[PDB]
Motif scaffolding. Structure first.
Motif, mmCIF file in Angstrom:
data_model
loop_
_atom_site.group_PDB
_atom_site.id
_atom_site.type_symbol
_atom_site.label_atom_id
_atom_site.label_comp_id
_atom_site.label_asym_id
_atom_site.label_seq_id
_atom_site.Cartn_x
_atom_site.Cartn_y
_atom_site.Cartn_z
ATOM 1 N N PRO A 24 22.609 72.594 27.005
ATOM 2 C CA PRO A 24 22.088 71.929 28.201
ATOM 3 C C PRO A 24 22.558 70.495 28.459
ATOM 4 O O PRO A 24 22.131 69.884 29.438
ATOM 5 N N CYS A 25 23.438 69.967 27.611
ATOM 6 C CA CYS A 25 23.938 68.590 27.760
ATOM 7 C C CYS A 25 25.139 68.371 26.845
ATOM 8 O O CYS A 25 25.431 69.202 25.986
ATOM 9 N N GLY A 26 25.809 67.234 27.027
ATOM 10 C CA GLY A 26 26.944 66.856 26.195
ATOM 11 C C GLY A 26 28.217 67.680 26.235
ATOM 12 O O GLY A 26 28.869 67.855 25.206
ATOM 13 N N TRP A 27 28.593 68.172 27.408
ATOM 14 C CA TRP A 27 29.805 68.980 27.530
ATOM 15 C C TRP A 27 31.047 68.099 27.635
ATOM 16 O O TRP A 27 30.946 66.892 27.838
ATOM 17 N N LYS A 28 32.217 68.722 27.517
ATOM 18 C CA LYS A 28 33.494 68.018 27.611
ATOM 19 C C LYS A 28 34.536 69.001 28.130
ATOM 20 O O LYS A 28 34.491 70.189 27.794
ATOM 21 N N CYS A 29 35.466 68.526 28.950
ATOM 22 C CA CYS A 29 36.507 69.417 29.448
ATOM 23 C C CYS A 29 37.229 69.899 28.204
ATOM 24 O O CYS A 29 37.533 69.104 27.323
ATOM 25 N N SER A 30 37.486 71.197 28.119
ATOM 26 C CA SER A 30 38.170 71.735 26.952
ATOM 27 C C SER A 30 39.646 71.348 26.915
ATOM 28 O O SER A 30 40.315 71.564 25.908
ATOM 29 N N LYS A 31 40.152 70.766 28.000
ATOM 30 C CA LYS A 31 41.561 70.379 28.056
ATOM 31 C C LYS A 31 41.858 68.885 28.147
ATOM 32 O O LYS A 31 43.018 68.480 28.082
ATOM 33 N N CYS A 32 40.823 68.067 28.313
ATOM 34 C CA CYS A 32 41.010 66.618 28.355
ATOM 35 C C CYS A 32 39.740 65.934 27.850
ATOM 36 O O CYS A 32 38.849 66.600 27.326
ATOM 37 N N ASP A 33 39.641 64.617 28.010
ATOM 38 C CA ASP A 33 38.472 63.902 27.505
ATOM 39 C C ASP A 33 37.344 63.619 28.486
ATOM 40 O O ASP A 33 36.422 62.877 28.158
ATOM 41 N N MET A 34 37.393 64.198 29.679
ATOM 42 C CA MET A 34 36.326 63.948 30.637
ATOM 43 C C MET A 34 34.996 64.546 30.197
ATOM 44 O O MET A 34 34.945 65.661 29.675
ATOM 45 N N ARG A 35 33.926 63.782 30.406
ATOM 46 C CA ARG A 35 32.582 64.208 30.043
ATOM 47 C C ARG A 35 31.713 64.325 31.285
ATOM 48 O O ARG A 35 30.554 64.717 31.205
ATOM 49 N N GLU A 36 32.280 63.960 32.430
ATOM 50 C CA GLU A 36 31.572 64.030 33.704
ATOM 51 C C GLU A 36 32.366 64.893 34.675
ATOM 52 O O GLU A 36 33.559 65.126 34.486
ATOM 53 N N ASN A 37 31.694 65.365 35.717
ATOM 54 C CA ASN A 37 32.342 66.193 36.721
ATOM 55 C C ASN A 37 32.984 67.416 36.063
ATOM 56 O O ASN A 37 34.166 67.704 36.258
ATOM 57 N N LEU A 38 32.182 68.126 35.279
ATOM 58 C CA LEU A 38 32.636 69.304 34.576
ATOM 59 C C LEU A 38 32.110 70.556 35.244
ATOM 60 O O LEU A 38 30.964 70.596 35.714
ATOM 61 N N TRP A 39 32.944 71.590 35.264
ATOM 62 C CA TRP A 39 32.568 72.851 35.885
ATOM 63 C C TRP A 39 32.625 74.046 34.956
ATOM 64 O O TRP A 39 33.623 74.270 34.265
ATOM 65 N N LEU A 40 31.549 74.822 34.972
ATOM 66 C CA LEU A 40 31.431 76.028 34.155
ATOM 67 C C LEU A 40 31.821 77.223 35.010
ATOM 68 O O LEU A 40 31.157 77.532 35.994
ATOM 69 N N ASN A 41 32.905 77.900 34.652
ATOM 70 C CA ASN A 41 33.323 79.059 35.431
ATOM 71 C C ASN A 41 32.375 80.215 35.088
ATOM 72 O O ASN A 41 32.257 80.608 33.929
ATOM 73 N N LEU A 42 31.702 80.756 36.102
ATOM 74 C CA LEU A 42 30.731 81.833 35.902
ATOM 75 C C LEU A 42 31.272 83.151 35.351
ATOM 76 O O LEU A 42 30.498 84.010 34.936
ATOM 77 N N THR A 43 32.590 83.322 35.347
ATOM 78 C CA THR A 43 33.156 84.547 34.814
ATOM 79 C C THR A 43 33.442 84.492 33.307
ATOM 80 O O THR A 43 32.994 85.368 32.572
ATOM 81 N N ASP A 44 34.179 83.476 32.849
ATOM 82 C CA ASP A 44 34.525 83.377 31.430
ATOM 83 C C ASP A 44 33.871 82.240 30.647
ATOM 84 O O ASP A 44 34.171 82.036 29.472
ATOM 85 N N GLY A 45 32.994 81.489 31.296
ATOM 86 C CA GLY A 45 32.320 80.413 30.598
ATOM 87 C C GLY A 45 33.137 79.187 30.231
ATOM 88 O O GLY A 45 32.663 78.341 29.471
ATOM 89 N N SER A 46 34.352 79.072 30.759
ATOM 90 C CA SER A 46 35.175 77.902 30.468
ATOM 91 C C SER A 46 34.538 76.661 31.105
ATOM 92 O O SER A 46 33.905 76.756 32.162
ATOM 93 N N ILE A 47 34.696 75.509 30.455
ATOM 94 C CA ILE A 47 34.154 74.244 30.946
ATOM 95 C C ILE A 47 35.367 73.337 31.152
ATOM 96 O O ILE A 47 36.029 72.954 30.186
ATOM 97 N N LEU A 48 35.654 73.006 32.411
ATOM 98 C CA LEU A 48 36.824 72.197 32.760
ATOM 99 C C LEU A 48 36.520 71.177 33.861
ATOM 100 O O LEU A 48 35.657 71.412 34.709
ATOM 101 N N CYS A 49 37.254 70.064 33.862
ATOM 102 C CA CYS A 49 37.013 68.994 34.830
ATOM 103 C C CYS A 49 37.356 69.300 36.293
ATOM 104 O O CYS A 49 38.212 70.138 36.597
#
Ligand SMILES: [Zn+2]
Length: 117
Positions: free
Chosen positions: A26-51
């Motif tokens: 529920p908190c503390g996510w990070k783009c799996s491809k860079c260092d962004m911790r804000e403006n992150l998006w969870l793709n509803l199909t595969d669960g990837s978290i990316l900026c």
């Protein structure tokens, strides 16, 4: 947090979600491809978290979520940190617009996300 009338995504009803999804905290996510911790998006199909995308004025993220879309075709993503017991910001790459997912509760539950934060 609400203030508009978004249309129902044409993908919402028949959205396919892959098996063995990760458990999205529920908190503390990070783009799996860079260092962004804000403006992150969870793709509803595969669960990837990316900026988020980079806007032409220079603001925004590093386009990782959109680049991911160009490769997978997985249309829906929800903005992490916008999920409230009532709803959240859902974006459709396909329809290029913020949309309403009437099955969001179910789609988020898939990742162990109880919309009762
Ligand atoms: Zn990124």
């Amino acid at each position: 947090w609400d203030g508009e009338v978004r249309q129902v995504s044409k993908h919402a009803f028949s959205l396919k979600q892959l098996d063995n999804p990760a458990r999205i905290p529920p908190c503390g996510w990070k783009c799996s491809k860079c260092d962004m911790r804000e403006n992150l998006w969870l793709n509803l199909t595969d669960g990837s978290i990316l900026c988020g995308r980079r806007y032409f004025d220079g603001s925004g993220g590093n386009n990782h979520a959109v680049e991911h879309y160009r490769e997978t075709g997985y249309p829906l993503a929800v903005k992490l940190g916008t999920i409230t017991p009532d709803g959240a910001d859902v974006y459709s790459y396909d329809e290029d617009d913020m949309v309403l997912d009437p099955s969001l509760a179910e789609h988020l539950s898939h990742f162990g996300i109880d919309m009762l934060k």
